[PDB]
From Swiss-Prot:
Functional description taken from the UniProt entry: Phosphoinositide-3-kinase (PI3K) that phosphorylates PtdIns(4,5)P2 (Phosphatidylinositol 4,5-bisphosphate) to generate phosphatidylinositol 3,4,5-trisphosphate (PIP3). PIP3 plays a key role by recruiting PH domain-containing proteins to the membrane, including AKT1 and PDPK1, activating signaling cascades involved in cell growth, survival, proliferation, motility and morphology. Links G-protein coupled receptor activation to PIP3 production. Involved in immune, inflammatory and allergic responses. Modulates leukocyte chemotaxis to inflammatory sites and in response to chemoattractant agents.
Keywords: Angiogenesis, ATP-binding, Cell membrane, Chemotaxis, Cytoplasm, Disease variant, Endocytosis, Immunity, Inflammatory response, Kinase, Lipid metabolism, Membrane, Nucleotide-binding, Phosphoprotein, Serine/threonine-protein kinase, Transferase
Assembly with partners or alone: Heterodimer of a catalytic subunit PIK3CG and a PIK3R5 or PIK3R6 regulatory subunit. Interacts with GRK2 through the PIK helical domain. Interaction with GRK2 is required for targeting to agonist-occupied receptor. Interacts with PDE3B; regulates PDE3B activity and thereby cAMP levels in cells. Interacts with TPM2. Interacts with EPHA8; regulates integrin-mediated cell adhesion to substrate. Interacts with HRAS; the interaction is required for membrane recruitment and beta-gamma G protein dimer-dependent activation of the PI3K gamma complex PIK3CG:PIK3R6.
Record's protein name: Phosphatidylinositol 4,5-bisphosphate 3-kinase catalytic subunit gamma isoform
Residue ranges of the region described as G-loop: 554-560
Length: 826
């Protein structure tokens, strides 16, 4: 069972989709996966330590960077321990374990003050990510000595040689000028079309019957597992598509009569174009009716030709000659882990004997299994180009080597790669499931990532809902309760936002009656509907309480987002500084998340070289359909507001440096803010250029009261500019027009340092950019090819440097021209 069904309805409301539903299925694949995921779930649930699971220590194995070492040049770290009224400092060694620190206190568990963050485990104090954050931001480590959480709170509820042929019967649309239509049928494996047959064109009426056998060149014997029957309707524009796996989840050849509801084309290779899901909109979609009733040493010239192809970028095209060379010299190629994506692409997957030879090659995998982990290389074997389950599994096996900290870095992109999986049950989906069940911070973000996709994609909601349910059946009752609180808040907040948008007109000014109407709605919610407290979706250590209703406003944007301010539910909190969240409707925040995540990856790439470029990747989490939560960075303003304070537009190079010294109460702070500005500006010019999101308006660029520059709103994105480096930015650097400056020559120094460092991880970035465009930007070959030129691929560090320095010179030669042209719109 009775309560066994009351739990499934809880699960459904938490997921945002009912997995028990068989209304849009043509086989048991979803149900088989739903059952197949119980084993890996139970295995991980039974293997995790309960107390370390409860305290989820956020830690790293990585060295403490050189810049944070200067911050503690004394070899002594101060930790202040609180208990009721008492608070006492303790001199600690960076290498000390929290247990050894605790020993020193009791001679005279640890929880971060105001956060659900624990400094527990056999890790040194220099390796805790909260300690590193204090070091970087020049903060004092305030901790409280309390009782550990009880693990009983994390408990789980007890659970032939013939040619292939397809008969196409016809097509039917409920509602349709007098045009012409035909059906194109493709045998696809990865992005490769193994065979293509078409029907004769028939007039485009609402019922189009053919009754034709489409006999392909491929033998049934030769059909590879994970091959798709891609059925397309053309009129020459592609209007409809649908896919069918030819070999099912139990290795059987697909047979019988099918009535498939198809996807419409709107306005190129999207992840949506690969889905095995059928369109659930039965009343308005197009349907298709089908029937299935079926060694000497290498010459130097060649080794060099082979090395030159192996060394090449992931977006460099492999010619037939390259593919034959790679395939012929496959045992030499196997010696290079970097050759693996190229070598697996040179395989004729439509030939059973070649696939067997490929599997034989995969068995001689000592040099791959030995090799150090390259995530960029691993991600390449997980994109749209690899559809083989054994090729993909060797990538997933490399991921198992990642520490939890690295999982969170790639998690979003890893969840998106599940879209490229032929089957619902994959090594990738099981890996994500196991990692989320092991660490609460991974499971927290995995929930929201999986949820954002269920609510915004019809193409993949069915697969992601089976993965979420498998996670939510193992995360444990406390985790379940947290998600419940969080989902309740978002739902009532979404309600409020839609009502606010409706009252307002299209007029620039947000009505003062509307901002009062909001104040009344938020008061009528807090009284008996809204939960007393919830975990912040984009910062799960941080718990929000009751709204500060007098601080809540509607932002003067045409999407009318909600500026919300909450009290911190934690009594031990160091400050009375409110928690600020932007609740926005209309924008699909997945793109923003994807860009904000690449920003974090670029920060790690930089850390690898002891380089800190002070980026500010603010919290941003897609919570549902066209909705989400955005972190409000406290003590921050837009460059456009600084440009409207002393100037007051309907600009001036002076105002920024003027605003910085006005905001800094001391000279050693103002100059620190100027270096912070020059590093953050360098960082954002570099990051923004390689991503091609450089040409921005002053409005979408912010700065903190500490000179920390940061771009915002990457949603959407004649005279062009590579990045934003307007004369006001140059004024803080102490220059005008074409003039040298100690800070400016240093800014060029940081840019080149940062740019050449990003170029050291070219492959990782290209693959992430491509994956982002494929799974989050609904793209073409040209749009993807941008980053190749941006990262000056195949070029030496000198030519590459001459490129970025000229980019700086473009912004200087253009001044405020492109900036004013942005304002000329308004
Ligand atoms: C509403 O549209 C967006 C805004 C931001 C964004 C992010 C951070 C901040 C803001 N907007 C505004 N803001 C801010 C303004 N004043 N203060 C200081 C305070 N309190 C903070 C931020 O920190 C990010 N993405 C968006 O669209 C996808």
């Amino acid at each position: 069972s009775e309560e066994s069904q009351a739990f499934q309805r809880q699960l459904t409301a938490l997921i945002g989709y009912d997995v028990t539903d068989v209304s849009n299925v043509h086989d048991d694949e979803l149900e088989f996966t739903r059952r197949g995921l119980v084993t890996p779930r139970m295995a991980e649930v039974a293997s995790r330590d309960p107390k370390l699971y409860a305290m989820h220590p956020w830690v790293t194995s990585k060295p403490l960077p050189e810049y944070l070492w200067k911050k503690i040049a004394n070899n002594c770290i101060f930790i202040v321990i609180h208990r009721s009224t008492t608070s006492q400092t303790i001199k600690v060694s960076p290498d000390d374990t929290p247990g050894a620190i605790l020993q020193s206190f009791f001679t005279k568990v640890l929880r971060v003050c105001g956060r659900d963050e624990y400094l527990v485990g056999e890790t040194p104090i220099k390796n805790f990510q909260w300690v590193r954050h204090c070091l970087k931001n020049g903060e004092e480590i305030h901790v409280v000595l309390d009782t550990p959480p009880d693990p009983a709170l994390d408990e789980v509820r007890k659970e032939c040689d013939r040619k292939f042929r397809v008969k196409i019967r016809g097509i039917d649309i409920p509602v349709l000028t007098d045009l012409t239509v035909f059906v194109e049928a493709n045998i696809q494996h990865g992005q490769q079309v193994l065979c293509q047959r078409r029907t004769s064109p028939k007039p485009f009426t609402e019922e189009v019957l053919w009754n034709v056998w489409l006999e392909f060149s491929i033998k049934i014997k030769d059909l590879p597992k994970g091959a798709l029957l891609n059925l397309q309707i053309y009129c020459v524009q592609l209007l409809y598509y649908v896919n069918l796996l030819l070999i099912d989840h139990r290795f059987l050849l697909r047979r019988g009569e099918y009535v498939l509801h198809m996807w419409q084309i709107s306005g190129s290779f999207n992840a949506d174009k690969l889905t095995s899901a059928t369109n659930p909109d039965k009343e308005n979609s197009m349907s298709i009716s089908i029937l299935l009733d079926n060694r000497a040493e290498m010459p130097n010239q060649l080794r060099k030709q082979l090395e030159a192809i192996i060394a090449t970028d992931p977006l460099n095209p492999l010619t037939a000659e390259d593919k034959e060379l790679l395939w012929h010299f496959r045992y030499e190629s196997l010696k290079h882990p970097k050759a693996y994506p190229k070598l697996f692409s040179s395989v004729k997957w439509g030939q059973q004997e070649i696939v067997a030879k490929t599997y034989q090659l995969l068995a001689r995998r000592e040099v791959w299994d030995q090799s150090a982990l390259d995530v960029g290389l691993t991600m390449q074997l997980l994109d749209c180009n690899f559809s083989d389950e054994n090729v993909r599994a060797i990538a997933v096996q490399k991921l198992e080597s990642l520490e939890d900290d690295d999982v969170l870095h790639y998690l979003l992109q890893l969840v998106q790669a599940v879209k490229f999986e032929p089957y619902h049950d994959s090594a990738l989906a099981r890996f994500l499931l196991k990692r989320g069940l092991r660490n609460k911070r991974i499971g927290h973000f995995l929930f929201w990532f999986l949820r954002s996709e269920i609510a915004q994609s019809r193409h993949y909601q069915q697969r992601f809902a089976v993965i979420l349910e498998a996670y939510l059946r193992g995360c444990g009752t406390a985790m379940l309760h947290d998600f419940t609180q969080q989902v309740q808040v978002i739902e009532m907040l979404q309600k409020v936002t839609l009502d606010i948008k409706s009252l307002s007109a299209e007029k620039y000014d947000v009505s003062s009656q509307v901002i009062s109407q909001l104040k009344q709605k938020l008061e009528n919610l807090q009284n008996s509907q809204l939960p007393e407290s919830f975990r912040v979706p984009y910062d799960p250590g941080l718990k929000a309480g009751a709204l500060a209703i007098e601080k809540c406003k509607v932002m003067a944007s045409k999407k009318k987002p909600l500026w919300l301010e909450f009290k911190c539910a934690d009594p031990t909190a160091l400050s009375n500084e409110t928690i600020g969240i932007i609740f926005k409707h209309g924008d699909d925040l997945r793109q923003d998340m994807l860009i904000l995540q690449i920003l974090r990856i670029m920060e790690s790439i930089w850390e690898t070289e002891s380089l800190d470029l002070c980026l500010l990747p603010y919290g941003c989490i897609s919570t549902g359909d066209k909705i989400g939560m955005i972190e409000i960075v406290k003590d921050a303003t837009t460059i456009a507001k600084i440009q409207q304070s002393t100037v007051g537009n309907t600009f001036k190079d002076e105002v920024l440096n003027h605003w910085l010294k006005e905001k800094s109460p001391t000279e050693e702070k103002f100059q620190a803010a100027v270096e912070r500005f020059v590093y953050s500006c360098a960082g954002y010019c570099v990051a923004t250029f390689v991503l091609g999101i450089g040409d921005r308006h002053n409005d979408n660029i912010m700065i903190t009261e500490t000179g920390n520059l940061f771009h915002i709103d990457f949603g959407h994105i004649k005279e062009r500019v590579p990045f934003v480096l307007t004369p006001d930015f140059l004024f803080v650097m102490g220059t005008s027009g074409k003039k040298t400056s100690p800070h400016f020559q240093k800014f060029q120094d940081i840019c080149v340092k940062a740019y050449l460092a990003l170029r050291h991880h070219t492959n990782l970035l290209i693959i992430l950019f491509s994956m982002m465009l494929m799974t989050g930007m609904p793209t073409s070959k040209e749009d993807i090819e941008y980053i190749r030129d941006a990262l000056t691929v195949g070029k030496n560090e000198e030519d590459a440097k001459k490129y970025f320095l000229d980019q700086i010179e473009v912004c200087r030669d253009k001044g405020w021209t492109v900036q004013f042209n942005w304002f000329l719109h308004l």
